[PDB]
Each structure stands twice: as C-alpha cells, then as structure tokens.
Write a protein that binds this ligand. Structure first.
Ligand code: CL
Ligand code: CL
Ligand code: CL
Lengths: 93, 89
C-alpha cells in the first residue's frame, strides 16, 4: 500500500496528541510519558502548539527536552511543525 | 491511531523516499526527506534494503561527523522508527 505524505503526517500528529494528552492529564501513564519524552527529545519540541509547549514546560517540565528553558518554547517550533518538517524534508535542525 | 499501524506506515513512507532518492532525477525532495530522517532519527537505511542503503550512503545521504562510532556502525531506520513510536528512545 502506497503512503501519502499529508495523510501520514496527520496520523503521526494525532498519535502524538493522544500521547501528550495522556502524559499531561495523568501521571503514572508510564508509556504515554515515555512516548512523549521520546518525541520531544527527537524533534526538540514540547507541545502540540506553542501554547501547550509553554504550559508543559512550566507545569510538567520533565516531559520537555533536557536543558529546555521556558521562554524558548515561546519562539521554537511546536511538535506539529517539526513533524511537518520531518515528512517534507525541511529538516528538524 | 494504532501504534503498530502508524509505525508501519512511517517505515513504508521512509522506504518510498529511499528508493526515490537513489534516482538523481527530480528527486531532490526525496533526497531531502531521506537526509532529514537520517539526521533526526540518527540512522542510515535499513537492513531490509541493503542495495538502496549502499547507494544513499554513497550519495552522501548519511553524513558523518558527530559520534564516530555511529559513523562506522550505522543504525537501522526501521528500528529507530519503531523506537520512536514505542517510546524506547
Ligand atoms: Cl496504540
Ligand atoms: Cl536488502
Ligand atoms: Cl554518507
């Protein structure tokens, strides 16, 4: 089966959103938090939007990339944007 | 979204880009996608696609530099995609 770039990007974001929501709402969600932490470290982001990345960095900072200050989350791309960069070949860096 | 299904689809997407990248004909986007996957996930090709992997490696789509062990001991992109969705890191 052929894979469409836009559709796969949408599914990944959706998967990540499910994970983020579980990691934040509920502690002890060990695997959601692991998935979220892996996405955040790999893509260098901390949220589905600028606003959720800021919120996560203030309230659940352990989920954010190491050495991440709060205020960078205001200016850095969010995880949805980094997922788009990945599949379009823009570059995560 | 099912974890197994999405990891499968992303690997298939990566495989598609890999085979397109080997053709140097209006595939500059596929080359960028392959290179982006390689740098983001820290991998180079897949053990399941040895012929393609050898070609992109020669096309300098697995650039070296940081982590010298990772320059000689390349990681499988399929495994790294699996690690991404399993949260293994
Ligand atoms: Cl699942
Ligand atoms: Cl092979
Ligand atoms: Cl190379």
């Amino acid at each position: 089966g052929f894979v469409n770039k836009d559709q796969i990007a949408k599914d990944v974001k959706q998967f990540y959103d499910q994970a983020l929501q579980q990691a934040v709402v509920d502690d002890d969600a060990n695997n959601a938090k692991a998935v979220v932490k892996t996405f955040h470290e790999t893509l260098d982001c901390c949220g589905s939007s600028t606003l959720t990345a800021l919120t996560t960095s203030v309230l659940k900072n352990n989920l954010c990339p190491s050495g991440s200050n709060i205020i960078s989350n205001l200016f850095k791309e969010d995880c949805h944007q980094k997922i788009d960069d990945l599949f379009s070949g823009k570059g995560t860096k």
